[PDB]
Paper text:
Non-ribosomal peptide synthetases are important enzymes for the assembly of complex peptide natural products. Within these multi-modular assembly lines, condensation domains perform the central function of chain assembly, typically by forming a peptide bond between two peptidyl carrier protein ([name])-bound substrates. To address this, we report the structure and biochemical characterization of complexes of a [name] domain bearing a stable analog of the acyl acceptor complexed to the acceptor site of a C domain from the NRPS that biosynthesizes fuscachelin in the thermophile [name]. The C3 domain of the didomain resembles other members of its class, comprising a pseudo-dimer of CAT domains with bridge (R2923 to T2944) and floor loop (A2843 to L2858) regions.
To obtain crystals of the PCP2-C3 construct with this substrate analog (hereafter referred to as Glystab) bound, we again used Sfp to attach PPant-Glystab to the [name] domain. The overall structure of the Glystab-loaded PCP2-C3 construct was highly similar to the holo-PCP2C3 construct (572/532 Å2 buried surface area (chain A/B) excluding PPant). In the Glystab structure, however, the density for the PPant extends through the acceptor channel of the C domain into the active site, as observed in the structure of the R2577G mutant. R2577 now forms weak interactions with two of the carbonyl oxygen atoms in the PPant arm (3.7 Å and 3.8 Å), possibly acting as a ratchet to hold the PPant arm (and substrate) in the correct position until after peptide bond formation has occurred. The PPant-Glystab extends completely into the active site, with the terminal amine of Glystab stabilized by hydrogen-bond interactions. Of particular interest, given the lack of clarity over the role of the active site histidine in the HHxxxDE motif, is its close proximity (3.6 Å) to the amino group of the Glystab moiety. An ordered water molecule also sits close (2.9 Å) to this amino group, where it likely forms a hydrogen bond. We also observed the close interaction of the atypical E residue in the HHxxxDE motif (which is typically a Gly in most C-domains) with the nitrogen atom of Glystab (2.6 Å). It is important to note that Glystab sits in a different position to the aminoacyl mimic in a previous model of a C domain bound to the acceptor substrate – in these structures the aminoacyl mimic does not enter into the active site as far as observed in our GlyStab-PCP2-C3 complex. With a functional condensation assay in hand, we first could verify that the stabilized Glystab acceptor substrate was a functional mimic of Gly in this C domain using intact protein MS together with PPant ejection (see Methods section).
Author numbering: 2481 to 2551, 2557 to 2999
The structure:
């Protein structure tokens, strides 16, 4: 759970009086000492509601270490002969592709504009190095009577897919097209690389497409970092000089599945967290009464669109200050605003919102390539018509309770709650909200001038997905990924504009009833 880390950083900043704090910043190096540690401890006790002492700050002086400390064995690397192991995340992502024709909805794109057209032969060499380094990028998933089995391809046997694509038409729609092309997870590695060139592009656009089975959005930064390292080494005619990974994805999965235990074991973390969710999701609505343009079709298509809401830097700043002043994360403010929006549209007082939560606290995977996002149902109650400030308190309590049981796999939660099912409706929630932060310092990759370009998706995973996305340097926008079966594009533009309006009012006056 990243939220503990963000709150610690928040406290460091207010106590040390700096706008300086990152996940790796040492409290004592930043000007903290034993006396000031009292104020960190006191504030964290009031915001997180757990026993913290100077003890923990001494042992774990960084926000990353402190957050992981006050919340299970460390990931251990297995032997060189170690067979691959699929995490329950990967098994669920494989299962999604069997239940539905997703049309590429579970591919994740990463697109980088480059001022120089890259060398396709060096690029292919660098991708091979990237795949050799990260086993998850060359792990196939084959079906069997049972379910899926991992198949780890040897580096020599991992046929990478790297190609140049000339752009006649515009590149942004071409990016969406390349992103949606399907992976056969049983025969192709879950990574595709395309270099878009053309008379209308200056340099090239480098497109990495992963299947989510091998990458979440936190994988963008190590993917670009490692690919940049391999590219520049191969351009110089040598293999990259790599510090080996502290852990492969299968190491993480084996450790996690061993600690999780079996659901029939009453002392297992799995059963204990499932029992929490069974009670926390009792009497859940099948779905929220949302204003759609078309009824829910019999078959889900995963066709989608993308509507953006721009946020003035003043608004971004006000939202950060509103979060800091109420002791919540920026995500929590966005989540509360989504709940108010659905509430005002007539969804009721019981608002379940799905949200991805990264399981990346262990230092061995904090910055590695893989899929670590569990999906949690964050159940927001809005009865009693409280203020926005009251709702921020409710949302913090709901989220911290939930984040303490973030390891129960979402598919096991569904199996435990047993909601009424329907293929055209995602179970337990149909609206997701998340907070995302794009990589910083990716401006000078591959010896050129580089910048990320966002890819307009033609797919959607739920009815609605709201993402508060920070670019790598202080900018932010809201992206609404909507199901095209249900919403016209103009309806989605209006929804995401209303979300911004709720945020404007909240920062202006959070003592206003919702
Ligand atoms: P933090 O690590 O920044 O600071 C810890 C301090 C406050 C320095 C703490 O360790 C401390 O005060 N140490 C000094 C303790 C000491 O000297 N005790 C002996 C006093 S002489 C009395 C003999 N009878």
């Amino acid at each position: 759970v990243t939220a503990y880390e963000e709150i610690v950083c928040q406290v460091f900043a207010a106590v040390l009086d700096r706008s300086d704090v990152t996940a790796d910043a040492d409290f004592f190096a930043l000007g903290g000492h034993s006396l000031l540690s009292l104020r960190v401890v006191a504030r964290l006790r009031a915001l997180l509601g757990v026993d913290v002492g100077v003890r923990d700050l001494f042992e774990a002086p960084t926000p990353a270490a402190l957050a992981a400390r006050l919340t299970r064995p460390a990931v251990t690397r297995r032997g060189p002969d170690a067979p691959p192991v699929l995490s329950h995340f990967q098994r669920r992502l494989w299962l999604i592709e069997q239940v539905y024709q997703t049309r590429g909805a579970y591919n994740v794109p990463l697109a980088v504009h480059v001022s120089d057209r890259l060398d396709l032969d060096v690029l292919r060499a660098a991708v091979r190095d990237l795949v050799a380094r990260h086993e998850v990028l060359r792990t196939l998933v084959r079906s069997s009577d049972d379910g899926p089995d991992p198949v780890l391809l040897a580096p020599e046997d991992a046929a990478v897919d790297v190609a140049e694509v000339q752009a006649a038409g515009p590149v942004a729609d071409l990016l969406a097209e390349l992103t949606a092309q399907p992976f056969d997870l049983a025969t192709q590695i879950p990574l595709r690389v395309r270099m878009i060139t053309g008379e209308q592009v200056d340099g090239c656009v480098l497109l990495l497409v992963c299947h989510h089975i091998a990458a979440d959005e936190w994988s963008f930064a190590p993917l670009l970092r490692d690919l940049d390292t391999a590219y520049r080494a191969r351009a110089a005619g040598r293999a990259p000089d790599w510090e080996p990974l502290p852990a492969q994805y299968s190491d993480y999965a084996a450790t996690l599945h061993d600690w999780l235990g079996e659901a029939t074991d009453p002392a297992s973390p799995l059963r204990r967290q499932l029992d929490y969710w069974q009670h926390a999701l009792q009497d859940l609505p099948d779905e929220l009464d949302l204003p759609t343009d078309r009824p829910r079709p019999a078959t889900a298509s995963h066709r989608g669109g993308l509507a953006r809401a721009e946020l003035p830097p003043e608004l971004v700043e006000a939202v950060r200050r509103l979060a800091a002043q109420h002791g919540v994360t920026v995500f929590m403010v966005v989540q509360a605003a989504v709940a108010v929006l659905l509430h005002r549209l007539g969804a009721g007082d019981d608002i379940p919102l799905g949200s991805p939560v990264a399981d990346r606290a262990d230092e061995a995977v904090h910055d590695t390539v893989g899929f670590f996002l569990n999906t949690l149902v964050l159940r927001v109650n809005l009865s009693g018509n409280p203020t926005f400030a009251d709702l921020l308190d409710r949302v913090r309590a709901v989220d911290l309770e939930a984040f303490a049981r973030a390891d129960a796999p979402f598919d096991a939660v569904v199996d435990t709650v047993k909601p009424p099912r329907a293929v055209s409706r995602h179970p337990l929630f149909q609206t997701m909200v998340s907070y995302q932060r794009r990589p910083s310092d990716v401006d000078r990759l591959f010896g050129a001038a580089t910048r990320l370009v966002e890819v307009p998706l033609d797919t959607a995973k739920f009815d609605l997905e709201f993402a508060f996305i920070e670019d790598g340097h202080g900018g932010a926008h809201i992206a609404l990924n909507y199901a095209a079966d249900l919403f016209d594009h103009d309806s989605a533009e209006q929804l995401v504009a209303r979300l911004r309006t709720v945020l404007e009012h909240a920062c202006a006056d959070p003592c206003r009833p919702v």
